[PDB]
RNA sequence: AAUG
RNA sequence: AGUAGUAACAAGAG
RNA sequence: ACCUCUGCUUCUGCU
């Protein structure tokens with residue numbers, strides 16, 4: 196959807212200085228530490244095996260209720276649901292050459308954004324934040 | 329003090345108490361105090377939950393294959409928290425932060441037991457310092473002084489048997505001069521232990537550079553001298 | 558063969574654990590040519606780690 | 609349907625390691641019952657020093673109890689389940 | 697700038713130097729960790745190559 | 749692990765790496781080691797055949 | 800500014 | 804033969 | 818046995 200509802204601009208040729216920075220690859224629903232996100236996934240999918248309750252259940256109660264509403268009556272096996280929930284909660288942060296934009300909606304199109312000698316003006320779909328603005 | 333525990337409790341209670349100590353990284357052969365405390369705790373939790381039963385209509389009786397209480401204390405930590413998560417998620421009662429010792433299917437409440445030696449109301453309020461109104465309470469002591477919870481349903485047959493067992497345990501501890509071992513604390517650190525055997529010590533001795541006879545000479549030469557220049 | 562050739566000027570002995578023939582080049586003699594030598598000096602390594 | 613897996617290399621059927629086939633399929637059955645009882649075992653690593661039979665027997669006993677306390681079993685099939693668990 | 701390669705790197709090192717390194721690095725550690733970190737150079741200084 | 753069980757070496761049941769490495773370096777002091785290996789036993793089948 |  | 808290159812294949816096993 | 822298995826499945830010892 197962020198690809199489809201996007202618009203493209205001019206392409207310019209000229210020098211580009213890329214700086215290798217540690218950026219977030221894909222945008223997230225909510226950025227959590229991996230053990231806290233594992234506790235969230237165990238509360239969403241396998242609630243009778245979550246073990247000792249943390250304090251993360253009270254912070255993330257609306258996310259758990261929403262994600263239990265959305266995955267209501269599906270027949271997809273829970274290992275795939277856990278893989279996709281871990282895909283949309285746990286961050287992937289890697290070192291990439293970045294010139295210009297480093298938000299995750301631009302890092303997911305960094306291959307077609309700019310190169311070493313060209314730049315492409317691009318604006319993704321969705322809605323941009325306020326801290327990034 | 330271990331033949332006391334060997335003759336006074338069944339093998340199941342002793343094995344469960346030893347595994348309970350081993351889960352918290354302790355040693356049962358070197359601490360009979362904590363082993364005795366967990367054996368007394370499990371014996372109380374099993375005598376209370378001995379023969380209370382709900383029938384197909386759900387009426388309790390003390391004399392079926394569905395008991396009134398489910399024992400959480402005694403099982404391994406992952407299994408006991410599985411039982412607590414399941415019983416909290418099924419009946420709708422909110423999951424407590426800590427691990428209760430029994431579950432009552434009639435009141436449908438988590439019943440936590442404590443064991444003290446002084447004022448039962450004192451240990452009652454010591455538990456209420458950290459619990460709140462999330463569990464029930466069954467506090468007992470060795471001198472016929474109990475303190476049950478304000479929404480309790482404990483009868484007086486098991487209340488006779490529990491205090492009779494506690495007083496008989498106290499009398500047999502004092503008869504063989506063993507209460508003095510339980511007054512004092514058997515405190516030692518269960519630090520990480522790693523003993524080098526015979527072959528690996530010989531291999532480490534012969535695996536030193538040229539100029540050293542054993543390994544401790546090389547180790548103290550590394551630690552002591554200053555090789556500057 | 559190449560491992561024992563580059564360290565044959567060290568201390569040879571027979572192990573009293575397994576029985577095999579062991580060679581010790583560490584704190585052996587200093588080299589005299591540009592052959593690959595495995596005679597590492599212990600004080601030089603300890604001075605490097607201390608720096 | 610394009611996430612298939614290739615077949616196992618069957619060169620071991622002629623060597624001296626054919627018992628390691630059976631020795632694998634004795635393991636797998638046990639694990640394929642364990643993830644039946646503990647569904648989170650594929651996502652979470654199971655922790656514990658107790659046996660693999662004790663954990664499964666306790667999980668099956670609690671499942672049968674919370675089945676009979678919700679009407680999802682009979683009064684007779686509950687007796688069959690608890691008799692089998694009394695054997696185990 | 698020297699563009700360099702190291703010849704005979706695996707044959708000319710020593711487990712007896714790595715033992716001294718694991719005794720120098722773990723100076724201020726407990727004794728059990730110093731006995732743990734000084735077993736891999738011991739098993740590597742007495743290794744036996746199977747030929748093939 | 750299944751061969752260490754036959755020698756009263758049980759650092760794998762406790763679940764940590766440190767008791768397992770303790771049993772590893774204590775198996776070097778064991779005078780004998782028992783393990784599971786595989787031999788072969790031959791068998792005659794009569795038929796209508798040659799040789 | 801980060802999130803190992 | 805040939806591929807190949809410090810040692811193999813040019814079918815192996817029952 | 819013009820029968821069967823195999824195509825990355827490792828050979829210390831049964832040899």
Ligand SMILES: [Mg+2]
Nearest residue numbers: 401427428429
């Ligand atoms: Mg408890």
Ligand SMILES: [Mg+2]
Nearest residue numbers: 699700701702
């Ligand atoms: Mg280079």
